[PDB]
Amino acid sequence: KFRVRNRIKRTGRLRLSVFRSLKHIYAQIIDDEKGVTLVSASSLALKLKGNKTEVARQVGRALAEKALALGIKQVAFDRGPYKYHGRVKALAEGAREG
Template identity: 40%
Template sequence: MNKDESRQRRARQTRIRIAEAQANRLTVIRSNTHISAQVYSPCGTKVVAAASTMEKDLRQAIKNGGNAQAAAQIGKLVAERAVKAGVVDVAFDRSGHRYHGRIKALAEAAREAGLKF
């Protein structure tokens, strides 16, 4: 089992637990150059709120979308949008990535902006 398969296995197990709990899910999608976050409804089919460094407004404000500062801005923005949509309690789905660096920055910014997880 290689590194990516291990990450996908961890992500799958996390998503199974979140689905059983019937919780809103804050998912993080990470690449080398960008980061995005989405809040899904408990059924997993509807996106309640989303934010990404690929959005036109943010691309101009953020020089580099692949660093912790950009991740913190995305965390704050997705939390504000989720709270505006009426979602406060979520389960954090880090997609199998370690809780470190950009993932941690996004999560902490989302907590500070009002999400509870």
């Protein structure tokens, strides 16, 4: 069911992997073809509060801060196993705030 990843990998680059847990939400900017992460705005690893949908939109900007500070823009969104809607859509909507 990771068909989504395969489809994204074929495109440009800079995959925004978005793993998410029962009370967590992570996100990396991985330039493959080397398997390395460039940015990693974690949530239950940062410190953020508790509201998830509200929390995700925050962690999204946490990437934007660390992203542009390095020079990145390919919004290649690795919407993993999870359907784009909840804390993922928010994590995204938030990431796209910049």
